[PDB]
Write an enzyme that holds these catalytic residues in place. Structure first.
Site, PDB file in Angstrom:
ATOM      1  CG  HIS A  29     -22.438  60.713  39.830  1.00  0.00           C
ATOM      2  ND1 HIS A  29     -22.294  61.019  38.632  1.00  0.00           N
ATOM      3  CD2 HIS A  29     -23.639  60.249  40.294  1.00  0.00           C
ATOM      4  CE1 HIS A  29     -23.158  59.794  38.184  1.00  0.00           C
ATOM      5  NE2 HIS A  29     -24.029  60.139  38.847  1.00  0.00           N
ATOM      6  CG  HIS A  69     -21.024  56.944  41.872  1.00  0.00           C
ATOM      7  ND1 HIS A  69     -21.489  55.441  42.176  1.00  0.00           N
ATOM      8  CD2 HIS A  69     -21.728  57.424  42.803  1.00  0.00           C
ATOM      9  CE1 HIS A  69     -21.784  55.338  43.421  1.00  0.00           C
ATOM     10  NE2 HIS A  69     -21.304  56.878  43.535  1.00  0.00           N
ATOM     11  N   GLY A 117     -18.857  51.712  37.146  1.00  0.00           N
ATOM     12  CA  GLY A 117     -19.959  52.097  36.697  1.00  0.00           C
ATOM     13  C   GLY A 117     -21.366  51.312  36.905  1.00  0.00           C
ATOM     14  N   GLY A 159     -25.044  51.095  46.973  1.00  0.00           N
ATOM     15  CA  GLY A 159     -25.234  50.123  45.727  1.00  0.00           C
ATOM     16  C   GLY A 159     -24.315  49.053  45.375  1.00  0.00           C
ATOM     17  CG  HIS A 262     -25.638  60.628  43.908  1.00  0.00           C
ATOM     18  ND1 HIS A 262     -25.351  58.595  44.089  1.00  0.00           N
ATOM     19  CD2 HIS A 262     -26.353  59.595  42.588  1.00  0.00           C
ATOM     20  CE1 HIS A 262     -25.141  58.539  42.771  1.00  0.00           C
ATOM     21  NE2 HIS A 262     -26.376  58.942  42.825  1.00  0.00           N
ATOM     22  CD  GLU A 405     -25.727  30.597  37.125  1.00  0.00           C
ATOM     23  OE1 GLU A 405     -26.016  31.578  38.528  1.00  0.00           O
ATOM     24  OE2 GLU A 405     -26.480  29.196  37.644  1.00  0.00           O
ATOM     25  CG  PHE A 431     -28.944  29.084  34.230  1.00  0.00           C
ATOM     26  CD1 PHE A 431     -30.098  28.915  34.218  1.00  0.00           C
ATOM     27  CD2 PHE A 431     -28.888  27.176  33.977  1.00  0.00           C
ATOM     28  CE1 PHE A 431     -31.382  28.476  34.274  1.00  0.00           C
ATOM     29  CE2 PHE A 431     -29.913  26.636  34.734  1.00  0.00           C
ATOM     30  CZ  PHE A 431     -30.956  27.111  34.455  1.00  0.00           C
ATOM     31  CG  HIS A 467     -32.978  23.748  32.670  1.00  0.00           C
ATOM     32  ND1 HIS A 467     -34.136  24.605  33.942  1.00  0.00           N
ATOM     33  CD2 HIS A 467     -32.030  23.595  33.092  1.00  0.00           C
ATOM     34  CE1 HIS A 467     -33.695  23.899  34.993  1.00  0.00           C
ATOM     35  NE2 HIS A 467     -32.577  23.257  34.446  1.00  0.00           N
ATOM     36  NE  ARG A 514     -28.853  16.141  28.622  1.00  0.00           N
ATOM     37  CZ  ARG A 514     -29.542  15.195  29.109  1.00  0.00           C
ATOM     38  NH1 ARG A 514     -30.731  15.115  27.922  1.00  0.00           N
ATOM     39  NH2 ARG A 514     -29.431  14.643  30.000  1.00  0.00           N
TER      40      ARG A 514
HETATM   41  C1  TPP Z   1     -29.242  29.154  38.435  1.00  0.00           C
HETATM   42  C2  TPP Z   1     -29.354  28.230  38.186  1.00  0.00           C
HETATM   43  N1  TPP Z   1     -27.481  28.163  38.002  1.00  0.00           N
HETATM   44  C3  TPP Z   1     -27.916  26.613  37.689  1.00  0.00           C
HETATM   45  C4  TPP Z   1     -28.940  25.462  37.392  1.00  0.00           C
HETATM   46  C5  TPP Z   1     -28.160  24.426  37.383  1.00  0.00           C
HETATM   47  N2  TPP Z   1     -28.652  23.523  38.698  1.00  0.00           N
HETATM   48  C6  TPP Z   1     -29.959  22.674  38.745  1.00  0.00           C
HETATM   49  S1  TPP Z   1     -30.140  21.835  40.249  1.00  0.00           S
HETATM   50  C7  TPP Z   1     -28.393  22.530  40.770  1.00  0.00           C
HETATM   51  C8  TPP Z   1     -27.436  22.714  42.144  1.00  0.00           C
HETATM   52  C9  TPP Z   1     -27.870  21.190  42.742  1.00  0.00           C
HETATM   53  O1  TPP Z   1     -27.556  21.915  44.240  1.00  0.00           O
HETATM   54  P1  TPP Z   1     -28.629  22.167  45.591  1.00  0.00           P
HETATM   55  O2  TPP Z   1     -29.357  23.228  44.800  1.00  0.00           O
HETATM   56  O3  TPP Z   1     -27.690  21.755  46.351  1.00  0.00           O
HETATM   57  O4  TPP Z   1     -29.475  20.763  45.535  1.00  0.00           O
HETATM   58  P2  TPP Z   1     -30.403  19.033  46.231  1.00  0.00           P
HETATM   59  O5  TPP Z   1     -29.062  18.633  45.027  1.00  0.00           O
HETATM   60  O6  TPP Z   1     -29.217  19.195  47.811  1.00  0.00           O
HETATM   61  O7  TPP Z   1     -31.410  19.066  46.174  1.00  0.00           O
HETATM   62  C10 TPP Z   1     -28.255  23.760  39.731  1.00  0.00           C
HETATM   63  C11 TPP Z   1     -26.503  23.796  39.761  1.00  0.00           C
HETATM   64  C12 TPP Z   1     -30.028  25.860  37.858  1.00  0.00           C
HETATM   65  N3  TPP Z   1     -31.525  25.076  37.475  1.00  0.00           N
HETATM   66  N4  TPP Z   1     -30.160  27.476  38.148  1.00  0.00           N
HETATM   67  C1  TPP Z   2     -26.431  47.497  38.430  1.00  0.00           C
HETATM   68  C2  TPP Z   2     -26.770  49.866  38.919  1.00  0.00           C
HETATM   69  N1  TPP Z   2     -27.995  50.113  39.235  1.00  0.00           N
HETATM   70  C3  TPP Z   2     -28.490  51.029  38.950  1.00  0.00           C
HETATM   71  C4  TPP Z   2     -27.176  51.720  38.459  1.00  0.00           C
HETATM   72  C5  TPP Z   2     -27.167  53.819  39.104  1.00  0.00           C
HETATM   73  N2  TPP Z   2     -27.387  54.375  39.724  1.00  0.00           N
HETATM   74  C6  TPP Z   2     -25.938  54.547  39.619  1.00  0.00           C
HETATM   75  S1  TPP Z   2     -25.460  55.637  41.537  1.00  0.00           S
HETATM   76  C7  TPP Z   2     -26.522  55.072  42.185  1.00  0.00           C
HETATM   77  C8  TPP Z   2     -26.732  54.448  43.075  1.00  0.00           C
HETATM   78  C9  TPP Z   2     -25.688  55.744  44.283  1.00  0.00           C
HETATM   79  O1  TPP Z   2     -25.764  55.234  45.703  1.00  0.00           O
HETATM   80  P1  TPP Z   2     -24.190  54.451  45.959  1.00  0.00           P
HETATM   81  O2  TPP Z   2     -24.120  53.617  45.834  1.00  0.00           O
HETATM   82  O3  TPP Z   2     -24.952  54.602  47.687  1.00  0.00           O
HETATM   83  O4  TPP Z   2     -23.104  56.018  46.020  1.00  0.00           O
HETATM   84  P2  TPP Z   2     -22.952  57.776  46.478  1.00  0.00           P
HETATM   85  O5  TPP Z   2     -24.231  58.405  46.269  1.00  0.00           O
HETATM   86  O6  TPP Z   2     -23.635  57.129  48.169  1.00  0.00           O
HETATM   87  O7  TPP Z   2     -21.476  57.139  46.483  1.00  0.00           O
HETATM   88  C10 TPP Z   2     -27.296  54.081  41.284  1.00  0.00           C
HETATM   89  C11 TPP Z   2     -28.470  52.973  41.183  1.00  0.00           C
HETATM   90  C12 TPP Z   2     -25.669  51.898  39.066  1.00  0.00           C
HETATM   91  N3  TPP Z   2     -24.335  52.444  38.447  1.00  0.00           N
HETATM   92  N4  TPP Z   2     -25.479  50.225  38.679  1.00  0.00           N
END
Ligand code: TPP
Ligand code: TPP
Ligand code: CA
Ligand code: CA
Lengths: 650, 650
Positions: A29, A69, A117, A159, A262, A405, A431, A467, A514
């Site tokens: 690159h 890159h 990367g 990216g 690139h 996460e 998760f 879950h 759990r």
């Molecule tokens: C990707 C993900 N990570 C974690 C959880 C666990 N989880 C379930 S509900 C929640 C968040 C609850 O807060 P909010 O989204 O504000 O809900 P509210 O109590 O206001 O409805 C979490 C962390 C999930 N469901 N999905």
């Molecule tokens: C998570 C992830 N998805 C895909 C790629 C593949 N990849 C490497 S470089 C790039 C993006 C290049 O564009 P930019 O980040 O704007 O780089 P520039 O050439 O402008 O420095 C991609 C999609 C990666 N490296 N990481």
């Protein structure tokens, strides 16, 4: 003009080392290094305190190339400033066994702070590094003894900023007020697919302002004075800073402002033209001694680190206990660990046993930081005595990651990379899927991040198939340099934490229930230290029930059903495949004797169990929304089915 | 005063059905349904066009409950409006085999549009639902013939908006200008850990404006006029709208504005106190006939659908050929497809062969939508004939997702759920890690998304270990309801695409090389349709080399190597474990004769190969930055190593 000329000569040395290393490799690159050379010049020559003779100097500024890159930008400037990265390594860019791999690898090249990367990882991990510097300063700095004082700089691409993880981490860095995190975004309007406006037209700096960051703009990367001012503006600001730096990918070449700049060598034609356009009379890999003399940081590095070591000596006299604790933690040395588990007197979920082990371990580990992705009361990660980290309370050892996460994984990795801390964070095992790339990067870097996963099976019950893990255990076990420990009980859970804390070579996944499970004997459970062990032996074994986690208890109940019918099987607890395979062959064969039929029991996918078992009681479908234990029993986890599975082999 | 009473009464029937169902289950999440009842009331009673008598009406407005934990909000309002969801199912919330699982599951409950529970998935998948409506409307609508016209409504929690996938998806929705996507955020300032200000203080609406969304505020969810106002403001706007809607979690209970209202039953005292504060006389699951009659949408539902049925017949008269294509596509019927593969003459990468297969297939498939996460030139996913989709060009069939694998996953799922489209998108196999929860959500829902993954091994060369898959094949194969097809060559690659297009039961991952590999016989490669097959047999086989993708070619080299020393082995190509497992036992045992020693060859993790092989030539470490073939050879993929491993058995 002789200052200007030497700046311009040194910047072009960066541009042409990158161009010619890509050309000789015929791979890599060249485009972003060509655009961003002036920034690498400015950071390594003027802005950053660092020591090329000791890349591990604890008080150095940290540079993260999130746009990995562009590796030759970093190799060129490490080479030029006097790091132990000889010219011969730049001529082996992307070649077997070289110190110049295609993407930066922490541990493989001196001065590489993070393996990058995978886009979004560098900029997200850097939030961890900056949080590590902030908390260690709060912990250790004393009036007239500033022993922790350094910045975290990042170069990020389009990216990086498209990836959700970078937005998660930016939300947290802003929430946390991490003022010493300074990110440069290469705003060059080009990505792999072509112009960014194919897919990426948001107001990037408006979004960062929404996260509580400072945003600044530099209209031309080639204008060093504009970069200096923005950086001085960033250091006065209490917010993390994103500096949009407009550049031309492939600057100075006939591929300038093209996606063709690139990701492939410029080719001899465009290399000859770039030479002519930028006024570079030097042939490949030749840089004049003038630039080397100008770029040498060995003497400033020695003087910076010596001033720090002298500041440490005055610290050791004014505060010998603090100083001894700082030095122990900066060396990665754990203090003595308890050998006695906590006392359990009734059935308990391995998540709660885990919270109990942490209550024991945390008071004796001031380096130990915990957290959860918004599952603190579900994951038992806040040890007794831990208080919340916040801007207001920089000493708190407990982190609220929110529902993030992926950035949790990246921030734990950065906290673990920095020196000073050992960090774990919690969510549900299902998760783990939201953070897989951060789990893999810890494995690749050899960073001993501890990932706490609760709600490990269908046994979690009513929350149902979205879950309930199935493929998760074997998907993590297949990853190189990841220990996966699934303790059977409260006592195994204590030994799982000792294993995780003493493992420095890579990450550990702790996998916890759990639901409440019975206790084992504390003496038997110490067998977890060998990864697999004979939990309940019998005279003249006719076979083996091998189990992990919660299923060990199912296995023991099945051992009684078989014993009532005169069939004799031993029960093996296999809390860790990885730690068991590391044992001598003699040990492994004592535990699982050749020639004996073996049934495995695990509420997860069957794929991989054929390594140890002739038949497996496992779960090769998604779960169901129903209470435990009904959901567990009706999806096939009964001691009668384990028994039947064993009887089918004899 | 009596309209108002019927609104308050109908809103409270939603609250108390939610409270009492959670109470009887002793499990689930009463808090968000309590706050958000007014919104559910308004969408299902006034705003949305839907038919409870036919949840599959293709021109219905789509509602996605992204905050899946609040499932009883949706269950209550589906019951109240006359969907086929009896009171008895509400009484069986979260119980084995019930139509009211703890999180919404598409195909298990009438009117559930997306399986949710993993936060970020619903709001992100909604973008694909809205993209599909927008494109199908562009493709099929004609002057005086609006056959596609519906909105995509989302209810999202704080947790949805912290997840980086929701940011990625929002960036693309604003870029794309998807005006008929309307999201309500429950801004209740509570998450599981306690107040949101523990971890979540960004200016969410400022971030959504940076994405090019309209943003609105409703200061009180109970103010139905304010809600009506915001929705009318959203439908007038040419941008996707986010409506921040302030609510009290646990509205009307002693647990109001507490994390305690989130995820456990109120308990008897708080239930009784809530009946009093809101003045609800009715015992559990009792709703007055007054409410059922007001909320019954069966008559209006049938009227909306017959109007659309009328407009379709009129369309069939005006546009016979469009109407036929529309109905074919809405039913998910494939048109006839080419039966012979492209003609290949030279060694070719399976990514390039995949491109050649799509050039052949796409022109026969107007439903077929393609895409890449900023790897279009690397993934060969733009078939000849496809043009870029953009706001200005809504007819383009090619989608530039940018560096957003996760939102690409979710959007592909949205497109494939909606009806009328079959969608695939490409990235590198290593970056499946960034999109794993959406892959899993395709497998849960049985949505036949086709995930194209190139750069499948260490053979990709110089980009190094951060780009080189190891664990990924087995990590994907462990997942229920996912085909993982790794074609050996150009010819296998064509049959892999046929298998994926024809599999409707769940998703398919196609795994393709960066590097060129030789051609197999066109006719031999047809064996891919059986998952595993004998590629090169011998006389009186002394053993089997079994291999996948590129390593099939290494296995033929090792076969010839062994014959030069008098050792006879057959070569089996196992392009898919799942398609082979699905064959009759007699076939599988023809392919792998019991008694014959088996060596497997795959440039990925060993774990899982014990199901088919006695010895495995595999990779159980991260890769290396070096050119192919050297990197593949030095990491132990040679005919000499494979022969050596068979000779260590024979
Ligand atoms: C990707 C993900 N990570 C974690 C959880 C666990 N989880 C379930 S509900 C929640 C968040 C609850 O807060 P909010 O989204 O504000 O809900 P509210 O109590 O206001 O409805 C979490 C962390 C999930 N469901 N999905
Ligand atoms: C998570 C992830 N998805 C895909 C790629 C593949 N990849 C490497 S470089 C790039 C993006 C290049 O564009 P930019 O980040 O704007 O780089 P520039 O050439 O402008 O420095 C991609 C999609 C990666 N490296 N990481
Ligand atoms: Ca760019
Ligand atoms: Ca909330």
């Amino acid at each position: 003009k002789e200052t200007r000329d030497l700046e311009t000569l040194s910047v072009n040395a960066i541009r042409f080392l990158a161009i010619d290393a890509v050309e000789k490799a015929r791979s890599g690159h060249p485009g972003m290094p060509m655009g961003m050379a002036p920034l690498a010049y400015l950071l390594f020559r003027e802005v950053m305190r660092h020591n090329p003779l000791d890349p591990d100097w604890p008080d150095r500024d940290r540079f993260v190339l999130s746009a990995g890159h562009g590796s030759m930008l970093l190799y060129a400037v490490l080479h030029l400033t006097g790091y132990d990265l000889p010219l011969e390594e730049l001529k082996s860019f992307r070649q077997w066994g070289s110190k110049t791999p295609g993407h930066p690898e922490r541990g493989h090249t001196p001065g590489v702070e993070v393996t990058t990367g995978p886009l979004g990882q560098g900029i997200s991990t850097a939030v961890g590094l900056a949080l590590a510097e902030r908390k260690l300063a709060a912990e250790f700095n004393r009036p007239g003894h500033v022993v922790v004082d350094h910045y975290t700089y990042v170069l990020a691409s389009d990216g990086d900023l498209m990836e959700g993880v970078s937005g998660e981490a930016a939300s947290l860095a802003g929430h946390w007020g991490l003022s010493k995190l300074i990110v440069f975004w290469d705003d060059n309007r080009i990505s792999i697919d072509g112009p960014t406006d194919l897919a990426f037209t948001e107001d990037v700096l408006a979004r960062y302002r929404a996260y509580g960051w400072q945003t600044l703009r530099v209209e031309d990367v080639n204008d060093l004075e504009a970069l200096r001012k923005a950086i001085k503006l960033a250091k006065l600001d209490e917010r993390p800073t994103l500096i949009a730096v407009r550049s031309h990918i492939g600057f100075g070449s006939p591929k300038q402002d093209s996606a063709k700049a690139h990701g492939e060598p410029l080719g001899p034609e465009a290399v000859e033209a770039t030479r002519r356009n930028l006024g570079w009379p030097y042939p490949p890999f030749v840089v004049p001694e003038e630039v080397y003399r100008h770029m040498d940081m060995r003497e400033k590095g020695r003087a910076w680190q010596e001033a720090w070591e002298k500041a440490l000596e005055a610290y050791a006299r004014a505060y010998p206990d603090l100083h001894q604790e700082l030095m122990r933690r900066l060396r990665g040395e754990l203090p003595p660990l308890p050998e006695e588990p906590p006392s359990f007197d009734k059935p308990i979920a391995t998540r709660a046993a885990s919270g109990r082990a942490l209550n024991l371990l945390a008071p004796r580990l001031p380096e130990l930081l915990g957290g959860s992705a918004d599952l603190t009361p579900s994951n038992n990660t806040k040890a007794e005595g831990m208080e919340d980290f916040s801007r207001a309370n920089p000493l708190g050892r407990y982190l609220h990651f929110g529902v993030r996460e992926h950035a949790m994984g990246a921030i734990l990795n950065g906290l673990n990379l920095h020196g000073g801390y050992r960090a774990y964070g919690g969510t549900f095992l299902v998760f783990s899927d939201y953070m897989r790339p951060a789990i893999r990067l810890a494995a690749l870097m050899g960073v001993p991040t501890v990932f706490v996963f609760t709600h490990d099976s269908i046994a979690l019950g009513e929350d149902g198939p979205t879950h309930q893990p199935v493929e998760h255990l074997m998907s993590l076990r297949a990853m190189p340099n990841l220990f996966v420990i699934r303790p059977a009980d409260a006592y195994e859970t204590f030994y799982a934490w000792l294993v995780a804390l003493r493992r420095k070579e890579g990450p550990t996944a702790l996998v916890l229930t759990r639901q409440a499970v019975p206790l084992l004997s504390p003496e038997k459970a110490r067998g977890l230290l060998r990864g697999g062990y004979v939990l309940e032996d019998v005279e003249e074994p006719q076979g083996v029930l091998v189990a992990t986690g919660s299923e060990v208890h199912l296995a023991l109940r099945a051992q009684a059903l078989l014993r009532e019918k005169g069939v004799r099987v031993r029960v093996v607890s296999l809390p860790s495949f990885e730690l068991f395979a590391a044992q001598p062959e003699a040990y492994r064969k004592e535990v699982l004797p050749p020639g004996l039929p073996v049934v495995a029991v695990e509420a997860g996918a069957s794929l991989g169990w054929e390594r140890y078992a002739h038949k497996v009681v496992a779960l090769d479908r998604f779960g169901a929304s129903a209470p435990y234990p009904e959901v567990y029993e009706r999806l096939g986890f009964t001691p009668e089915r384990v028994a039947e599975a064993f009887l089918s082999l004899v």
